[PDB]
Design a protein around this ligand. Structure first.
Ligand code: PLP
Ligand code: PLP
Ligand code: CA
Ligand code: CA
Ligand code: CA
Ligand code: CA
Lengths: 292, 292
């Protein structure tokens, strides 16, 4: 099982050689804020050359796919197809298209920003507060979606609760990341904090779209035939990316350039909490390139 | 132990006769919104006549003591001394006066309304955003207090987190009630929902002031010699008032005019969760009067 081994040498050559593809978490892995992890772009270049597939999975609900694609390019990750990029915004839009109840024969009440709303509308979803048809009633709200919402308020929370009074109204969260580190050492609250407030006030459990939910893997694999037994999952958060990998049956690699510390992985290992223990770790993903 | 017995007849006469005093939760017990529970005022009148002490304990952080006292009178509860009324606002102010760290050799950042702020200032506390002395630096924030905040926002959450980056900064919540029922059947989010968001984003556990924290009982008993072995605790919420009573060693009485249902108490009893099981229940507190 996962023993949190430092991946290097012949083992690294073996692990990467056997892998048919690599699934990358983004923040803490490819970059921190506006700074690419040195050697990250070169890894992705060498992977493409090695004939190994690369896919990208982020819990970030801020950007619709077109703006996400621009961000990869800007940070040095060139030549990527938009189809290789998966975010919790995109997959939440897809989950709601697939699951929204109501007769054919709802509207979605969204706590979140314009990039999220853009992604939802692109998937064909009607949003609460979109303008109504003629002067008829507003459509019935059949899901509440909690994403990263820099305009979160008590009034919006109260309104979310009102919608959720109907037990057939879905409650969905893009992700449960509790907070994110910023470049100056400060932190921004994460969607997990807002989801906590909504779940508490409504007495509901949210359906989570993003990592570590297996749903995210369903979203990625709708379009892509990938064998999880031959896929490496690389990420910086034990409770999100490494747990995701284990749930999906992938080999997990913790990179140490982000949120989680080696000491924490080792502590979980000691406590026998194996689903929070990576199979392997690297100081940064630049350490992988040698294995090709 | 607690067996959730319907309190009536000779048993009621015995229980009330032996009691030296009664501690009442307020909402769901004495009133629902602006409507007194019929017969509640008459109970309190008869209790005073029986020579039995009455004290009142509410998690409501909206009103400072003077406005709270007006509310009791208005609902039909006359003749009360302000000293008999305890709220999570009053006791949070007291806890912070007692615990605020820093040299003699802080300020308190408050998420909450004007009644809470009034209570804190009356206890001698300086509040973040109170005006600074001359043109010197703002005082160091040494506690974050989360109360009922109808103006809660993402920006305030972010700011709470910034203060909490200092591990010596306290995190205190007035209460963890998750939501409260309104007269039209709707609900308002409770402090517990906001506390959840703050704890999640900061990765901290809050110190809770109100019920079911034993601290609330310390607050009430600072001024009042009451024997918990001779005190009845009467409330409508299993996870708040009944748990509080058990933690304090009081005889607990669930009234059925509020949040918790008899069926839920019986379910907990069945599951052997005795600290969430009331010793006794009544349809409403008006059922107690006969026992005098
Ligand atoms: C709101 C939000 N969600 C998620 C993340 C990053 O997600 P991931 O680490 O899954 O790429 C960030 C990082 O910027 C963020 O700002
Ligand atoms: C914000 C808030 N806190 C607490 C409560 C009631 O508290 P309790 O049931 O402890 O009296 C209410 C009920 O109105 C409320 O509005
Ligand atoms: Ca990450
Ligand atoms: Ca480390
Ligand atoms: Ca109550
Ligand atoms: Ca009942």
């Amino acid at each position: 099982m996962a023993r949190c081994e430092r991946l290097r040498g012949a083992a690294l050559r073996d692990v990467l050689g056997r892998a048919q593809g690599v699934l990358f978490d983004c923040d803490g892995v490819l970059w921190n804020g506006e700074r690419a992890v040195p050697g990250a772009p070169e890894l992705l270049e060498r992977l493409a050359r090695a004939g190994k597939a690369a896919l990208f999975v982020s819990n970030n609900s801020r950007r619709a796919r077109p703006e996400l694609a621009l961000r990869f390019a800007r940070l040095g990750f060139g030549g990527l197809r938009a189809e290789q990029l998966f975010s919790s915004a995109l997959c939440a839009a897809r989950l709601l298209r697939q699951r929204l109840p109501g007769p054919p024969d709802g509207a979605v009440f969204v706590l979140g920003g314009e990039g999220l709303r853009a992604e939802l509308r692109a998937a064909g979803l009607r949003l609460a507060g979109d303008p109504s048809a003629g002067d008829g009633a507003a459509p019935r709200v059949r899901a509440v979606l909690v994403g990263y919402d820099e305009h979160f308020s008590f009034a919006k929370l109260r309104e979310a609760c009102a919608h959720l009074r109907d037990p057939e109204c879905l409650l969905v969260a893009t992700d449960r990341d509790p907070w994110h580190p910023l470049s100056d050492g400060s932190r921004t609250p994460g969607t997990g904090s807002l989801a906590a407030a909504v779940e508490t006030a409504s007495g509901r459990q949210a359906l989570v779209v993003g990592k570590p939910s297996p749903y995210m893997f369903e979203c990625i694999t709708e379009n892509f035939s990938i064998d999880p037994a031959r896929t490496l999952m690389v990420g910086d958060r034990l409770e999100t990316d490494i747990l995701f990998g284990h749930r999906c049956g992938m080999t997990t690699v913790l990179t140490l350039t982000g949120v989680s510390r080696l000491e924490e992985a080792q502590a979980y290992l000691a406590a026998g909490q194996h689903d929070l223990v990576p199979h392997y770790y690297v100081e940064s993903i630049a350490d992988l390139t040698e294995g090709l």
